[model samples]
Target chain A: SFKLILAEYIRHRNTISGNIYSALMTLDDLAIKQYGDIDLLFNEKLKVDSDSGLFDFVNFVKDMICCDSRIVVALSSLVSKHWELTNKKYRCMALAEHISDSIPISELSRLRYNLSKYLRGHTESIEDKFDYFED
Target chain B: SFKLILAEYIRHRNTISGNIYSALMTLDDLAIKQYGDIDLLFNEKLKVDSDSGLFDFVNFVKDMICCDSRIVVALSSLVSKHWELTNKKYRCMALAEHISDSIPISELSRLRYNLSKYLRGHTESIEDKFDY
Candidate 1:
């Protein structure tokens, strides 16, 4: 696969777009950059997917390794490791979108129902007030 | 009754939680503060629910106002206006938790189904890249 090839190939000998140095982004780096930016992320840097294609970016990794949990863990570790250096919160939201895409409907529905059910009857409030709450 | 009486009462005049200021978080300040902190969000601030209480916090507002869309809109405006000062991402997650709580089961189901369905059978990629 392109990902494996890129991850493996770039590591052994790197370069792209031009110099080997350019391609030095080990799979790890790409993992972090994937959220921060795309122009520097992939081959064509297909920043925005075409109307017929959107699932390619967010759901690609898990798709590749779902059959093998070990592989998934390895890659996930690589990606997550570099995340701390970036704006984690910004990237996390984007990461969530990726996660949302991977889950199945049947499971998601059950989860959603329970989650909604919980929120529905909950007596909590939409609280506010900063300076005062602290004290 | 608690919120309205409290929201309105805490205002016009203020006092509680060992004193009035405790009960006096004006709607505007609370609007922004809502995300970053809670314990002081409500009467008990009910930090956590017992075995039977969870939905209370996440879906509370829209629950109060959905009966009157106008009220829902008013509250939504109040809450969102103050978000600018918070770490939008943290609060956004919390807010999303609230949203997931509020949307009716039926609508959430539809939205969820479409959202999931869209992700399925899609030719997308979970792209990555970093330092290099």
Candidate 2:
């Protein structure tokens, strides 16, 4: 099988991506076929970071989300380790923008101006304003 | 038994290595007791390495040794990464020293001298001497 694969490599091995590509093929670890596999995510920080070692997920995900990644996971594995406060707030902000495309310029400034007062226990009033614009 | 274990956390909540140690516990993971377990090897390079992620093996050994650690393993997990030509030779060297304690030293120099020549197609002669 290695010889069968090696012949194709000799044919197309001169491409620019070939160094890392051929290394993955020849090395017994990450074989050439794995590039097609479902689990290997494209790097999230692709512009700045390396594609090397930012490889695939080992197996299918567990049905539940887990925080206990260090165990049962390979120490080298990159599971998104945490979903902290920043993530929760970021998602809520996204949902706010999504609910109404253009709530008339009338409502946009109102939502913007009301943003801070909500955390000050003015939560009910701002939500009622968006609920009006949502439809 | 540890169903009541959370109560102990309320007890030990305020200690040092507590962050790492307690995180090891409670998290349905390599619990506090695992720091006491065998396979989660202490760091091989303890002086320079951080013990933070130098952790225990995920499962039992494979009966055979392997090189495919990045798969079947967390990329963060460490397996001794590679072995080059010298790894083979080095093990043979260790085997040589172990075979004969003090080999009366009269023989030690002879064996070390013979080491190189054996690879030069003189394998039969050396084994015969060790066999003797």
Candidate 3:
């Protein structure tokens, strides 16, 4: 079910607003809300983050989603490998989103805003560069 | 480079004119024309065709294209497993297209037309259903 939805989602992801990060956050919220945590669903060992391996994980997600495989498995694997927050959230949201195809775009935008805020805060005055021009 | 092209292709596939079949055939023609044959490029053992494995090959292609992996590897594997013509052609076109990105949409349409004709001839009167 989630696999089917995610298959469609990935296929039509361009039409959907927000980037991968937001989508993962939305999914994470739903997943945690639905299941206790990602640990309950998957038992894979966590992978250590490596410089060369960055491409591998994204590739794995693409493979799983493209083939319409059990996306939860890929999401779980991703979380175990890296992005403790993003991956777990994606797993949860995918599972939860399947229950009813009803994750709103506004929510995705909100989640995106949250991540952007965090990034902006970390970078300090970069936000002001754009803000200064706006009347 | 071809991987980047295919990645862009897949990401914006909706905007493209033809389906996977057309795209593959166009690639096949260019490959054969450029290289002697797919056999020269890849040497992996061919797998026996099985009823249960239909989904696997497509899945493999998606994985390769999505990850921006050496798409020729996937195409080669696909041909090794099945789609003797389609996979080989895709490999050639992918490699060839990168040289200049010169494969025309019309060429793709022509290739698609050729495949459709072949399928139609194999089934005979089925073509007449629409022709009529």
Candidate 4:
């Protein structure tokens, strides 16, 4: 697996930049293997279970999110690619709720807002006042 | 000043969007008051202590990070406006470490990385082989 190769690179190089390069390569390969093109995979269904490698990638990106700039790019790509699947099948929303405060609001696009809407419910309670003012 | 007004809006309206509108208006007023320009306040110094309203703004932004899209815009402005001062004085880096994981990496613009680097040390502990 790419993670094994990445781990080996880390063992030898012991550098986060090296590992990030390897990780990006791994992502490229996954896309190539799946669709015969790099950066072309999108809107695909993913399993919530461990067998799909979704959880592994989640932890991988989560750990790397704090460490490097490339991870920022990688994560943006990852979320854009598979957020819908993860949000529906897994507890991506719940996990997001638990840890979103640590991140500044300028990253990851609308991932936090999209996932959090489930928990906060509709922001429509003030519609009566809105209608009254309009009327 | 704005926080108080925002809280008052929340009390009266009990809606996040209403308070968000008030908050945005307050931010606009601050810029106007400071520079007579609605959005020209930039690179200003802020005290780390409670006197400069920085901490209150930090708490306000932190609490609002999860609930709304307007907050998303407000936070980006706040960070762009005062992140340097927050990073320097009040351990914004430390607080970021404590809560960033819950956020998807797509939201904030490199804020975590910028602030966290001070704590993670240099990412260059393996340069010996470059010589070899």
Scoring only the A-chain of each prediction against the true A-chain gives TM-scores of 0.27, 0.18, 0.25, 0.27
The TM-score that candidate 1 achieves is: 0.21
Best by lDDT: 3
Comparing 3 with 4 on lDDT, the higher-scoring candidate is 3
In order of lDDT, best first, we have: 3, 4, 1, 2
TM-score of model 4 (CA atoms): 0.20
RMSD for each of the candidates: 23.1, 25.3, 18.5, 22.5
Better of 1 and 4 by lDDT: 4
**Predicted structure with the largest TM-score when compared to the true one:** 1
Model 2, A87-134: lDDT tens digits are 322212211221222123344444334433454556533232334454
Better of 1 and 4 by TM-score: 1
Off by over 4 Å in 3: A1-30, A43-111, A118-135, B1-57, B60-132
Clashing pairs in 3: A27-A89, A27-A93, A28-A89, A31-A92, B27-B89, B28-B89, B31-B92
Superior candidate under lDDT, 2 versus 3: 3
lDDT of 3 by residue, B1-132 (tens): 433344344323323344443343344444355455556343332221322122233333443332322233325333433333433222222222231132234433343344455555663211112221
Weakest 10 consecutive residues of candidate 1 chain B by summed lDDT: B123-132
- Tens digit of per-residue lDDT, candidate 4, span A1-135: 322322233222222354234434333333344345323333333332222233333444455343332333334334433433443222232222222322333332232232233235554211111122222
The estimated TM-scores of all candidates read: 0.21, 0.15, 0.21, 0.20
Better of 2 and 4 by lDDT: 4
TM-score of 2: 0.15
TM-score of chain A of 1: 0.27
Q: After aligning candidate 3 to the native by TM-score, how far in Å is the CA of A1 from where it should be?
A: 32
